[PDB]
Amino acid sequence: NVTNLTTIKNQQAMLKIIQDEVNSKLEMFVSLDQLV
Amino acid sequence: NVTNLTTIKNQQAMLKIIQDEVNSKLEMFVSLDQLV
Ligand code: NA
Q1: Testing the interface with A: which of B11, B27, B33, B34 to mutate, by most A Cβ within 10 A?
Q2: How far is C-alpha B14 from the chain's CA centre?
Q3: Which of A31, A33, A34, B4 is surrounded by the fewest CB atoms within 10 Å?
Q4: Which of B15, B29, B35 sits opposite A29 (nearest CB)?
């Protein structure tokens, strides 16, 4: 039972970092859409 | 054990936000593809 709570933590941190990574690429796709 | 649930609720909220943002971007991608 301890482990799941710990996993949820580590997974929380790793989810947060990856969810921050996607946006930077996205904005350029936004700029390309504006250009087109 | 209750904390694990609270952290899991935080997981669900965070993903939710991310789940949205990505859908909002994919819609504009679809619009671009149809236009091209
Ligand atoms: Na794209």
Answers
A1: B11
A2: 8
A3: A34
A4: B29
Experimental method: cryo-EM
Amino acid identity, residue A4? N
Tokens of A11: 């997974």
The three-state (H, E, C) secondary structure of B1-36, written as one string: CHHHHHHHHHHHHHHHHHHHHHHHHHHHHHHHHHHC
The secondary structure element, H or E, covering residue A14 is: helix A2-35
The CA-based dihedral angle spanning residues B5, B8, B14, B16, taken in that order and rounded to the nearest 10 degrees? -90
Residue recorded with tokens 């947060």? A16
Resolution as reported, in Å: 2.8
